From a paper:
The complex consists of a tripartite ring comprising SMC1, SMC3, and RAD21 (also called SCC1 or Mcd1), which associates with a conserved peripheral fourth subunit that, in human somatic cells, is represented by two paralogs of the [name]/STAG protein family, [name] or [name]. The [name] protein is composed of HEAT repeats, a tandem repeat structural motif composed of two α helices linked by a short loop.
We have designed constructs of [name]’s N-terminal and central region encompassing interaction regions I and II, and IV, respectively, and obtained crystal structures in both the presence and absence of the corresponding RAD21 peptides.
Author numbering: 459 to 546, 550 to 678, 683 to 841, 855 to 911
The structure:
Amino acid sequence: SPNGNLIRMLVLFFLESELHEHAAYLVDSLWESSQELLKDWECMTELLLEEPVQGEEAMSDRQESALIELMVCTIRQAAEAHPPVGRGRVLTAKERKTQIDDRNKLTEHFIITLPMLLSKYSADAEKVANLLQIPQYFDLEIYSTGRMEKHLDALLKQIKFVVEKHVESDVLEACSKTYSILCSEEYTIQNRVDIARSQLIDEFVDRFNHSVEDLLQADDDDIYNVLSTLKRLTSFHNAHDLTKWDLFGNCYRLLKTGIEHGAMPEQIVVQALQCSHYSILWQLVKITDGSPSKEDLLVLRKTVKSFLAVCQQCLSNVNTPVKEQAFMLLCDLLMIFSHQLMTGGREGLQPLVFNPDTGLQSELLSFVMDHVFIDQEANKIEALHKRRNLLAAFSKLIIYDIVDMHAAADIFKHYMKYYNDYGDIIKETLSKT
């Protein structure tokens, strides 16, 4: 493949030079002139899947990662037929025809080759997370049309292998999204994916339940067995309703054990808090869409009240990731279960309304002082945007007077004191320089 040499050098140009920071911007800039080369997906998957021939240099691991990332960018650009975010709308008749044929080409090719790609690179977390961004651009009807049921089985097989081998959050999130996508088209393949997903969840709920009992009744393995299985269940509980498995019960036991004795690892606490939050959100969805009874509402109220106390108690955990996690869920729940919940003819949801007492408001205000306004490279701007999200989620409680909006203003005036006292002098000084 002479196109193979061009693809190889394009990967080299993207890695060796600093002219293009993002792969999506490089693909977009060359899309007008090199669209046919950038859509030779048969050539890209052959470079990734075939072994080097005699006299040919093997691709390094970084070049294979860049080729995968570039390949996914071309898949998006061909399927969506518009530049990526940041570079952005009527398509001509030919462009719409090109999009339909592109969508058909990439769907048939990657329904076959994505299982092969996932199998070869199953251990590489960054590569698998990128490869799992591909099914969202599939024309999923082809699974039934082209009689490609065996390739759906091969994809479901490789996703389960990926879930079983990985604990990274981006990998587990990409697997969860792929399961959600595969159940969003037609019921014949929806039922086949539901069977594979439910069996995958059943196997990890059993392993999680057995690990929780091993831990509470500790070893390094006991800690890993709980954390690793809880990570996969927490990642799937966002997009998948896992309430038929009573996951809140064991998460509550883990959090209560960590509150009394204070020996629970921080990441088990963070995952247990997040998993419990997801369970509550799904329980609210089911209780909202249906016609619940008085017992249904008060059962969820008992659950939310006990979890609000756990999040408040977790604010005193020695580990700051637990504080931030509990604080984010506090600001989330106090906004969801406020009087906002009674909008749109849903006054029957009043028993689910919660008002934070004085002690909780004071502890929420304390977190802002010690963990949002702190004294003291790529992790600095990430922690800054994290603290901004923490303050933004807390500011919504201020606007609607869920917390003491006056006590929060005095905290704001305190940390803005240098700007109100010397800001005018500093502004006009930096202007004339």
